[PDB]
């Protein structure tokens, strides 16, 4: 086990005992540490640093390694930093990393300084270097006035570090860059024995370290067994204009190319019958036939399920889309509520009112939205607003609040069956063909579709850019629009000529059916592995192939009604907020309601004002009455459905205005059948999710965030349970099956039952071609095969430590992790200059 020092920001500052170390390096040094930071640390947080001891005033002299945030930004863009200030140069010189740190990821942060060349490395890649400082750090005469601290700063401001510190190593000379990539391989070399000044152990803390100024000892943790190696493949983050992993160019291309990834899917959709004991049976039958005819050519058929609601109470009320009962009486003209019945019982607070909102109908019905696509019938006042649909990337895609709302008069009637097809396409992740030219904000909008592209507009190349036009002809020049797709189902053109979905849109329809709506289909086969396996290691006798998990992300045998969907491969249990509340006046307008802090995060642009996050202060129609937070502070009580021994808690605070560090005045973790534990004020960044490791002796069932800030916005919150939580005890992990171009021994696929997604093959002969395919089988129902990895044994490949101009590689850093100087496609990034066969990128 590796001892670890967790600093919680709760007054834990260590100091080096004088007896342990004879003298701190003065001329040259090399400080390296495995630091696992957590979201929302102090602005100039220090993980370690040598500071003046004799001087009692502010002591920026010496050096400090940690995390710093840009002054011009302050609230966001926090990057690893290393600030050194010798007695010669008046101003401290700060090396700042190139990327904002990743909380929860073990990062090997190192920094060397020998004479003048001071360099800062992250995970072995030199992310900064400078020569501003020169000469020895300080005169030896006052060398006794320099002392080393961990997770703190000498100043009284208390620059506390929040996160884990695994190991700390201190040399007296700047080690070569190649050491850091091979820090675990340079195991106490004989030649550098005299240079190894310090090697912190941390198992006994009292033996080597003493708390600074009565502050408590930082918590001591021990790793039970060897931890999994750091992930070698970076996640497929969505593009700038995308919103999901199915908007990525690589996965989209794989779905367009590999036709098994567009197989026969049979969706299930539910229809809430609306007819006197409005929507008759003929409407349902005709609409179902039209839907099947318009969607079966794309290997998507639909099964009809009609849910008859014999509640006359809901039968009589007019259901209005987006017209909440509380909107009436706001001194403004609301287009959604210009109904005769909204201005015989028009009182919103009456149990027998004749008008209702579709949200209320959804909440009252609470239909099974986990296995069905529910269709609702709300009569919208607007004649042009036929209906609405829920995005896959919205928090309510599969919950009872999701589905399609369609006007009864436009459902199943001849000449109007294509509106439901449009809305269903909206459900399955399809934007409007006029996205980027009609639905564009400004001329600088990246999503603007000037040329057929997979990253702008509706994220489809086949769909040419066209303005929103009702004519079934190429629009007039407003930029020209040749070959406008007025025949596409996702255009505002009438039924008579919108007929087809382009292959790109069909690939999208299938990608989002596998990703989010897997449960809707009747297939028990787990979703398909999105990207083909890639080779991460090769020898003269063995080949190692790594593969991503199923696109849906479910790594367990998904049984209907079970919790296996949210269980990680090691038994962890991740769950978002299930309920919310606020002791401030619960605004009835429906905006910034506690339900906005429920489910997965929704804020598209973090750290800017948004309508998808809870917020106390924001009142639209009361400008003079700027209600401030009470003395007790505005509170948000997020309740999680299932109590579990919490491992971690994450708050998505995506906005705030108070420049003080006390935006979160307190964070009271609520246990079950026990008292609540207060965690005191915590710092947070608007762009990063604040993270807290829960050291609590009980089952956490909620969190009560107290805030003195009026404009703070909590977009969502997540609770991660202890590994091997019981909630997933009955769940069965998903195994994997691998097939090769030649049949394996006996010809059967190899069964990889592990959870780190790696397979080693020893039956490979040099010079032969092999085709690797992977299935994530579960429960005996074998899934779909992955796209084929074609590799000739011995051939060069990315992430093999050898640059090859033959294959177009530039920086083959030896790993498939992007951002570490070179991309996973073995391509030089901006500002990086990777040199040497084991490429060592640098700014
Ligand atoms: C729809 O699914 C069918 C399978 O039922 C796919 O069919 C194959 O099509 C490819 C070309 O795309 C051919 O090379 C194969 O020989 C076909 N096989 C069979 C069994 O038909 C079809 O490609 C899919 N198309 C879409 C748009 O989803
Ligand atoms: C959704 O329908 C399936 C199919 O029978 C059922 O097993 C499941 O329990 C339903 N959802 C809920 C939340 O009950
Ligand atoms: Ca939200
Ligand atoms: Ca290579
Ligand atoms: Zn639309």
Calculate ∠ Cα 821-822-828, nearest 5°: 110
Question: Which ligand neighbours the alpha carbon of 520 most closely?
Answer: 2
Q: Where are the alpha helices (DSSP H) in 432-479?
A: none
Q: Is 560 in the pocket of ligand 2 (CB under 6 A)?
A: yes
The three-state secondary structure class of 467 is: coil
Q: Is 368 in the pocket of ligand 2 (CB under 6 A)?
A: yes
Measured CA to CA in angstroms, residue 214 lies from 12, 13, 57, 205, 401 at distances of: 9, 9, 19, 15, 53
CA of 268 to the centre of ligand 2 (A): 12
CA of 259 to the centre of ligand 1 (A): 6
Judge contact between 200 and 35, C-beta under 8 A.
no
CATH topology match: 531-555+734-792 vs 574-728: no
Residues in a beta bridge with 614? 714
Q: What is the dihedral of CA 690, 757, 226, 122, to 10 degrees?
A: -50
The domain segmentation of the chain, as residue ranges, is 3-222, 265-417, 531-555+734-792, 574-728
Burial class (CB in 10 A: 0-12, 13-18, 19+), 46: buried
Three-state secondary structure string covering 244-273:
CHHHCHHHHHHHHHCHHHHCCEEEEEEEEE
Length of the chain as a residue count: 843
Most informative mutation of 259, 266, 505 for ligand 1 (most atoms within 8 A of CB): 259
Q: At what angle do helices 503-515 and 249-257 cross, to 10 degrees?
A: 110
Question: Which ligand neighbours the alpha carbon of 827 most closely?
Answer: 4
Indicate the resolution in Å: 3.1
CA of 240 to the centre of ligand 4 (A): 29
The three-state secondary structure class of 425 is: helix
CATH architecture of residue range(s) 574-728: Sandwich (2.60)
110: nearest Cα among 128, 98, 92, 130: 128
Distance CA 560, CA 737 (A): 24
Judge contact between 21 and 117, C-beta under 8 A.
no
Q: Is 260 in the pocket of ligand 1 (CB under 6 A)?
A: no
Q: Are strands 318-320 and 355-357 parallel, antiparallel or unpaired?
A: parallel
Question: Which ligand neighbours the alpha carbon of 805 most closely?
Answer: 4
Burial class (CB in 10 A: 0-12, 13-18, 19+), 303: middle
Judge contact between 738 and 748, C-beta under 8 A.
no
Report residue 14 as tokens.
Answer: 């260590």
Question: Cα–chain-centroid distance for residue 261?
Answer: 24
**Cβ-based neighbour number of residue 482 at 10 Å:** 8
The three-state secondary structure class of 674 is: coil
526: nearest Cα among 781, 803, 816, 266: 781
- Elucidation technique: cryo-EM
Question: Which ligand neighbours the alpha carbon of 638 most closely?
Answer: 3
Distance CA 44, CA 214 (A): 22
The three-state secondary structure class of 225 is: coil
Distance CA 335, CA 390 (A): 21
Q: Is 508 in the pocket of ligand 1 (CB under 6 A)?
A: no
CA of 316 to the centre of ligand 5 (A): 28
Measured CA to CA in angstroms, residue 624 lies from 289, 326, 588, 629 at distances of: 56, 21, 19, 15
Question: Cα–chain-centroid distance for residue 534?
Answer: 23
**Cβ-based neighbour number of residue 597 at 10 Å:** 30
Distance CA 251, CA 258 (A): 10
Residues in a beta bridge with 543? 538, 761
Q: What phi, psi does 146 have (nearest 5°)?
A: -115, 130
Question: Nearest C-alpha to atom 3 of ligand 1 is from which residue?
Answer: 263
Distance CA 391, CA 91 (A): 52
The three-state secondary structure class of 653 is: strand
Report residue 561 as tokens.
Answer: 């009604």
Judge contact between 29 and 243, C-beta under 8 A.
no
Report residue 253 as tokens.
Answer: 């291309």
Domain 531-555+734-792 has CATH 2.60.40.10: yes
CA of 834 to the centre of ligand 5 (A): 47
The CATH T-level fold of domain 3-222 is Jelly Rolls (2.60.120)
Helix (H) or strand (E) holding 362: helix 358-365
**Cβ-based neighbour number of residue 350 at 10 Å:** 10
The three-state secondary structure class of 151 is: coil
Longest dimension (CA), the chain: 97
Question: Nearest C-alpha to atom 23 of ligand 1 is from which residue?
Answer: 259
359-383 b/e with 16+ CB inside 10 Å = b? bbbbeebebebebbbbbbbbbbbee
Query: What secondary structure letter does DSSP report for 733?
Result: B
CA of 534 to the centre of ligand 4 (A): 12
């Amino acid at each position: 086990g590796l001892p670890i020092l967790y600093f919680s920001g709760r007054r834990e500052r260590l100091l080096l005992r004088p007896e342990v170390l004879a003298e701190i390096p003065r001329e040259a040094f090399t400080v390296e540490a495995w630091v696992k930071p957590e979201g929302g640390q102090n602005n100039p947080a220090i993980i370690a640093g040598v500071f003046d001891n004799c001087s009692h005033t502010v002591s920026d002299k010496g050096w400090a390694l940690g995390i710093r945030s840009g002054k011009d930004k302050g609230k966001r863009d926090a990057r690893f930093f290393f600030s050194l200030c010798t007695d010669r140069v008046k101003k401290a010189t700060i090396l700042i990393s190139h990327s904002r740190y990743q909380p929860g990821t073990w990062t090997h942060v190192a920094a060397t300084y020998d004479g003048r060349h001071m360099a800062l490395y992250v995970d072995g890649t030199q992310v900064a270097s400078s020569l501003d400082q020169s000469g020895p750090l300080n005169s030896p005469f006052m060398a006794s006035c320099r002392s080393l601290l961990l997770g703190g700063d000498s100043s009284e401001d208390g620059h506390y570090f929040r996160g884990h510190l695994g190991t700390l190593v201190f040399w007296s000379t700047a080690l070569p860059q190649s050491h850091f990539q091979h820090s675990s391989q340079h195991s106490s070399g004989e030649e550098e024995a005299t240079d190894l000044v310090l090697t912190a152990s941390f198992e006994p803390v009292n033996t080597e370290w003493v708390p600074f100024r009565d502050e408590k000892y930082p918590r001591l943790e021990v790793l039970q067994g060897f931890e999994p190696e750091p992930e070698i493949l970076s996640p497929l983050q969505p593009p700038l204009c995308g919103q999901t992993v199915c908007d990525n160019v690589e996965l989209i291309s794989q779905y367009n190319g590999y036709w098994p990834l567009r197989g026969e899917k049979v969706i299930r959709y539910q229809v809430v019958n609306i007819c006197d004991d409005i929507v008759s049976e003929e409407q349902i039958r005709l609409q179902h036939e039209a839907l099947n005819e318009a969607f079966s050519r794309y290997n998507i058929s639909w099964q009809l399920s009609v849910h008859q609601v014999h509640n006359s109470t809901l039968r009589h009320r007019v259901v209005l889309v987006n017209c909440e009962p509380s909107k009436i009486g706001n001194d403004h003209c609301d287009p959604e509520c210009e109904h005769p019945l909204t201005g015989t019982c028009f009182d919103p607070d009456s149990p027998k009112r004749a008008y209702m909102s579709v949200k209320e109908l959804k909440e009252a019905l609470q239909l099974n939205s986990t296995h069905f696509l529910n269709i609702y019938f709300a009569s919208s006042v607007r004649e042009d607003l036929a209906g609405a649909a829920t995005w896959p990337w919205d928090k309510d895609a599969v919950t009872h609040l999701g589905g399609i709302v369609l006007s009864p008069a436009y459902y199943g009637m001849p000449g109007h069956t294509d509106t439901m097809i449009h809305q269903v396409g909206h459900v399955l992740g399809l934007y409007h063909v006029f996205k980027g030219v009609s639905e564009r904000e400004s001329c600088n909008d990246p999503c603007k579709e000037t040329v057929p592209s997979m990253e702008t507009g509706d994220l489809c190349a086949d769909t040419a850019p066209t303005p929103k036009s009702e004519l079934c002809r190429e629009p007039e020049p407003t930029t020209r629009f040749p070959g406008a797709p007025f025949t596409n189902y996702m255009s505002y053109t009438d039924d008579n000529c919108t007929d087809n979905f382009t292959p790109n849109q069909v690939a999208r329809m299938h990608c989002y059916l596998d990703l989010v709506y897997q449960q809707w289909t009747e297939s028990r086969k787990p979703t398909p592995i999105p990207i083909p396996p890639m080779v991460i290691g090769q020898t003269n006798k063995s080949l190692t192939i790594h593969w991503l998990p199923p696109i849906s992300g479910v790594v367990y045998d998904r049984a209907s009604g079970s919790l296996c969907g949210a269980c990680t491969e090691d038994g962890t249990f991740r769950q978002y907020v299930h309920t919310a509340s606020s002791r401030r006046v619960c605004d009835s307008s429906g905006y910034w309601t506690p339900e906005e802090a429920v489910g997965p995060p929704d804020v598209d642009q973090p750290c800017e004002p948004s309508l998808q996050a809870w917020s106390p202060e924001v009142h639209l129609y009361h400008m003079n009455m700027t209600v401030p937070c009470p003395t007790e502070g505005c509170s948000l009580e997020l309740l999680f459905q299932h109590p579990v021994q919490a491992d971690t808690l994450t708050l998505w605070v995506t906005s705030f205005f108070m420049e003080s560090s006390q935006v979160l005045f307190d964070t009271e973790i609520l246990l079950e059948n026990k008292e609540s534990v207060h965690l005191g004020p915590l710092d947070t960044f608007c762009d990063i999710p604040l993270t807290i490791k829960l050291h609590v002796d009980g089952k956490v069932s909620g969190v009560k965030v107290y805030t003195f800030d009026e404009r703070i916005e909590i977009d969502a919150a997540l609770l991660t349970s202890q590994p091997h939580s019981p909630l997933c005890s009955g769940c069965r992990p998903v195994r994997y099956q691998v097939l090769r171009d030649p049949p394996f021994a006996s010809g059967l696929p190899v069964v990889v039952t592990h959870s780190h997604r790696k397979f080693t093959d020893v039956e490979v002969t040099p010079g032969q071609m092999y085709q690797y395919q992977v299935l994530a089988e579960a429960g005996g129902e074998l899934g779909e095969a992955s796209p084929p990895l074609n590799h000739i044994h011995g051939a060069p490949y990315c992430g093999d430590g050898k640059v090859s101009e033959r294959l177009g590689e530039e920086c083959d850093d030896g790993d498939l992790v992007s951002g570490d100087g070179c991309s996973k496609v073995c391509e030089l990034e901006e500002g990086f200059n990777c040199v040497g066969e084991p490429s060592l990128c640098y700014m």
